[PDB]
Amino acid sequence: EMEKEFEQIDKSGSWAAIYQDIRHEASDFPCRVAKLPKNKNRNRYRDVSPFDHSRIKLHQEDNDYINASLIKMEEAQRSYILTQGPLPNTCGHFWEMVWEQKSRGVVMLNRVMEKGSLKCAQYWPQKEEKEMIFEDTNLKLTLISEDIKSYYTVRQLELENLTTQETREILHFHYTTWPDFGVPESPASFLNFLFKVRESGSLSPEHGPVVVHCSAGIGRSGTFCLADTCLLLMDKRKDPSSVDIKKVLLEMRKFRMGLIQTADQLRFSYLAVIEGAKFIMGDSSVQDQWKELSHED
Ligand SMILES: CC1(C)CC(Nc2cccc(-c3sc(C(=O)O)c(OCC(=O)O)c3Br)c2)CC(C)(C)C1
Numbered sequence: 001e002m003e004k005e006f007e008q009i010d011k012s013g014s015w016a017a018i019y020q021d022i023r024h025e026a027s028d029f030p031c032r033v034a035k036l037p038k039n040k041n042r043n044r045y046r047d048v049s050p051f052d053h054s055r056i057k058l059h060q061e062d063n064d065y066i067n068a069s070l071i072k073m074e075e076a077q078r079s080y081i082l083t084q085g086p087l088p089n090t091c092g093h094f095w096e097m098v099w100e101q102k103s104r105g106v107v108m109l110n111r112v113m114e115k116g117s118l119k120c121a122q123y124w125p126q127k128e129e130k131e132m133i134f135e136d137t138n139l140k141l142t143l144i145s146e147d148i149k150s151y152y153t154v155r156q157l158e159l160e161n162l163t164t165q166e167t168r169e170i171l172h173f174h175y176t177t178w179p180d181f182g183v184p185e186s187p188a189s190f191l192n193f194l195f196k197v198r199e200s201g202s203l204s205p206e207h208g209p210v211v212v213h214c215s216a217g218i219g220r221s222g223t224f225c226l227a228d229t230c231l232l233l234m235d236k237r238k239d240p241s242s243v244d245i246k247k248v249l250l251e252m253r254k255f256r257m258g259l260i261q262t263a264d265q266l267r268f269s270y271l272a273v274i275e276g277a278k279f280i281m282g283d284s285s286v287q288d289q290w291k292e293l294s295h296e297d
Contacts, residue, residue, distance in 0.1 A: 001241045006270045019263035022246060027254045029053055039065045042093070044084045048216045054255040056081060058093055059100050066093045067217070069256035070209065071225060073248075076232045079209035080225050082256050084217040085110060085120030092134030094123055095141060098170065099161060103211045105171045105202025109224060110214040114180045119215035124157060124172060138162040144169075149296040151177040151185075152193050154200075173197050178220055181261055183268040187275040188293035190268075194228060194276075195287060203228075219261030226252060226260060227272040231280060240277045245270060 009018055033039065034049035042065055043049060050056070050069040058064040067090075068083030081101060086094040098106065110119050124141060125132050131142040144156040155172035175193055177185065184190035197203065202210050214220040226249050234243050249266070253259050260266050278286045 002243060002245050002270055003240075003274055006267075006274065010267075015263040015267050018246075019260075019266050022249060022253075022260075022266070025250060026257070027250070028257075029254075031055075031257075033065055034067065036065070038063065042087070042090055043067050044087055045216050048084070048218060048258060050256060056083070056097055056101065058096055060096070066090065066097055068097060068211075069217075071252055071255040073229050073232075073251065075251075076229050076236070077205065078203065078229065078232055080228075081209045081211045082217045082221045082225065082259075083211060083213045085213055085215045086123040088121045091121055091123040091132075092137035092139065095134055095139050095159060096137040098211055099139060099159060099168070101211075102208030103170070104168075104204070104207035105173060105197060105200060105210045107173045107175070107197055107210060107212045107221075107224065108214070109175045109178050109212070109220040110180065111176055114215070119180070120213075124155065133162075151175070151189060151294070151296065152196070154196065171200050171202050173200070173202075175220075178214075180215065181219065183223070183264055184272075186293065187268070187271045188290040189295075190227070190272050191276050191279075192290040192294040192296065194224070194272075195279075195290070198228075216258075218256060218258040219265060222249075222252065222256075222259030222261070223265045223269055226269050227276070230269075230273045231276045234273070234277060235280045238281070240281065243273070245273060 029051040031049035031051055033052050054069050056068040056070055058066055068081055071080045112120050125143040128143050133140050140160040140162055142158045144158050146155040153174045157170040157172055159170050160167050212221045230243050230245055230248055234240050
């Protein structure tokens with residue numbers, strides 16, 4: 001049981017060992033496509049690549065490669081696309097993926113610039129009057145509105161397939177205070193944000209998989225998805241004790257390498273799930289509590 005395991009690991013200060021054990025047992029599959037010479041400039045990080053068996057394929061004959069993985073959690077019955085921060089040359093690809101995969105929401109857990117360095121391209125419009133057109137993929141993106149909070153911003157986008165003139169609304173959830181290689185300031189602020197995504201309907205099975213990205217698409221993104229999946233597994237069974245977090249993380253890692261970068265991100269995952277469990281099991285006050293504690297105003 002996660003709560004007992006957490007206290008046991010915390011008492012013996014062995015999170016480093018626990019995390020390294022996950023790295024040791026983690027799946028290993030080929031990423032031949034990602035490693036092809038022609039795709040070198042489509043990868044932000046040389047060592048972070050999507051496995052061939054679960055990579056997202058762009059629907060185009062020229063080059064279908066993007067650095068993104070489909071994390072399909074069979075038991076939980078929820079899918080996520082984890083991808084890198086789009087590069088200056090892959091923004092059209094990014095939105096082509098969102099369109100073709102029918103995603104309704106995009107979760108960004110990083111800031112464009114972090115520690116002096118540029119972790120992601122500016123792949124959405126910042127002003128209503130200046131919409132973006134991705135000529136290579138023939139798509140138009142317009143900022144419709146945005147709700148700015150103290151540590152996160154929710155953006156309403158309109159994505160147009162210029163070829164068919166079909167239009168779709170995309171919700172952008174920008175987490176703006178999650179330190180790279182770090183953890184959210186508190187379980188409350190993380191949960192408040194996750195529930196924002198959840199309550200938007202973006203995670204519904206009626207839409208395509210939600211797209212989740214930080215910089216490399218594995219550390220912060222992995223932490224976000226592990227917490228959400230665990231709460232879902234717990235929810236479907238209404239039994240917190242039946243969830244093996246480490247086992248869930250390893251399942252996730254069969255679809256994308258490196259999920260969760262640090263031992264503290266893993267530790268935080270337990271914290272978030274344990275706290276979130278209160279809501280799952282029918283506490284109607286914690287949600288408002290988290291909102292208050294998050295200081296979003
Ligand atoms: C064990 C190991 C060799 C470690 C290796 N680490 C490895 C290799 C290349 C890049 C990264 C990065 S850079 C970065 C950032 O925002 O700058 C990251 O995001 C931080 C965050 O989101 O918290 C991560 Br993650 C990590 C990743 C692979 C999968 C190669 C396995």
